[PDB]
Design a protein around this ligand. Sequence first.
Ligand SMILES: [Zn+2]
Length: 148
Amino acid sequence: MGYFSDDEAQSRKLILDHYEIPDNKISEDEASKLNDIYVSFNNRTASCIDNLTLYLKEENGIIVDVKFSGIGCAISTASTDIFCTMIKNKKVNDISDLIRKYFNMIDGDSFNEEELQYLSVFKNISKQLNRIKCAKVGIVAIEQLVTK
Ligand SMILES: [Zn+2]
């Protein structure tokens, strides 16, 4: 929220606006009536209230629609949503790349702000305590849904 740095306040509205107004977050009503072309994975962390179910739909090697649902914090609802908007018409390869490249930046290592884009606000969550699993919980669910 501060304004000494240039990134901080701009980076702390992307989280606030993808957590109070997520783009791809559905209701438990809306999820049950989804077409059975969607796959699902629920991942839960015990370090927060983050228990999210992801929904991906494949159309000839291209992920066409991604939605997520459930309970989550700002770090979980922003990381999932921002990730969801970006994997939105990409292929089942070049998503598995973002996931591990995102995880390496979450693990405090090399990242490309051109490849990770608005996931680069999470570039130093390994410095905030017990927030690493909050920024991995929803993307690990996507990870399973791309492989299995
Ligand atoms: Zn959390």
